[PDB]
Design a protein around this ligand. Structure first.
Ligand code: HEM
Ligand SMILES: Nc1cc(N)nc(N)n1
Length: 292
């Protein structure tokens, strides 16, 4: 029964949001020591996904619109352990630009991180509006990592994502790493973990993977190169339909970039009704493109 209409922050336009993008991007460059010099890019991408991934297509609950991660129930979701680091990073940004909504800020943080890490451009639309504490979705809507391809496929149907969209989105697991204290998994998915590339797919196909137990007594796939895959990551090469798509992205960087950009924008916009006369999506310039 539930409609969330995008409403542009009063009087704001592209230039306002480019300023917010720039402040996030400059801080990404500045605060470079975080997580053993990985920097904040990966955790900001994960934050944007987790605030969006609570969405349920069946009743339009959850989703990025309401900015509900700011409330303790969601902030404290065991599935969100570690994301507090991303939230703290964004605090001074919100202080400088207090007019931006929380959902706009969290989602823009993810777009900025992807682009600054040399990923694809992600078109982004403003107008998410903060909603009250009672609209916060319950814990348990984000996915488990110990499961198989059938679980992944069914899970993502709730977010209206198909096989191609799922495999494209999972390529973000090239970024950052798993941390034992956060999730019960430990290690990175590859070498270039603060640069956005198609390495996730190459590593799935090319590494010699061993099913091992980590120090939290959970199974994960490890390679001699020091990379790891979650059981749900590895499921993408166990299922024949996912495997074909993995091979496609391993062999076509541009196609992966284009498909990721579409799926990630869609993820960040699920649940939102944009008026016919809403502004077109914004495509922000990187700091590099601006000579900044
Ligand atoms: C089946 C679906 C997925 C599962 C089970 C899953 C699970 C996980 C787990 C367990 C971690 C480690 C968290 C930690 O220990 O800090 C992680 C990290 C991460 N995830 Fe996912 N994830 C999924 C999909 C996605 C998607 C769709 C995206 C975004 C498009 C994403 C982006 C990330 C990023 C960037 C990190 C690294 C964060 C950091 O380095 O701090 N994941 N994921
Ligand atoms: N988030 C990540 C990063 C990474 N390097 N590997 C995996 N499996 N997941």
């Amino acid at each position: 029964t539930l409609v969330h209409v995008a409403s542009v922050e009063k009087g704001r336009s592209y230039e306002d949001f480019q300023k917010v993008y720039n402040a996030i991007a400059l801080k990404l460059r500045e605060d470079d020591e975080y997580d053993n010099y990985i920097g904040y890019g990966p955790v900001l991408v994960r934050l944007a996904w987790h605030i969006s991934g609570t969405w349920d297509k069946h009743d339009n609950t959850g989703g990025s619109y309401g900015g509900t991660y700011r409330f303790k129930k969601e902030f404290n979701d065991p599935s969100n352990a570690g994301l507090q680091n991303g939230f703290k990073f964004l605090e001074p940004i919100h202080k400088e630009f207090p007019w931006i909504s929380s959902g706009d800020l969290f989602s823009l943080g993810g777009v900025t991180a992807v682009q600054e890490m040399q990923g694809p451009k992600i078109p982004w639309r403003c107008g998410r509006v903060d909603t009250p504490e009672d609209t916060t979705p319950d814990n348990g809507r984000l996915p488990d990592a110990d499961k198989d391809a059938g679980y992944v496929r069914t899970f993502f149907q709730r977010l209206n994502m198909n096989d191609r969209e799922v495999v494209a989105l999972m390529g973000a697991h090239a970024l950052g790493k798993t941390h034992l204290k956060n999730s019960g998994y430990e290690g990175p998915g590859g070498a270039a973990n603060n640069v956005f590339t198609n390495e996730f797919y190459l590593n799935l196909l090319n590494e010699d993977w061993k099913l091992e137990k980590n120090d939290a007594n959970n199974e994960q796939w490890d390679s001699k190169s020091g990379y790891m895959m979650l059981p749900t990551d590895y499921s993408l090469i166990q299922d024949p339909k996912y495997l074909s798509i993995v091979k496609e992205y391993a062999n076509d960087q541009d196609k992966f970039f284009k498909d990721f950009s579409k799926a990630f924008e869609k993820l960040l916009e699920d649940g939102i009704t944009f008026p016919k006369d809403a502004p077109s999506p914004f495509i922000f310039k990187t700091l590099e493109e601006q000579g900044l």
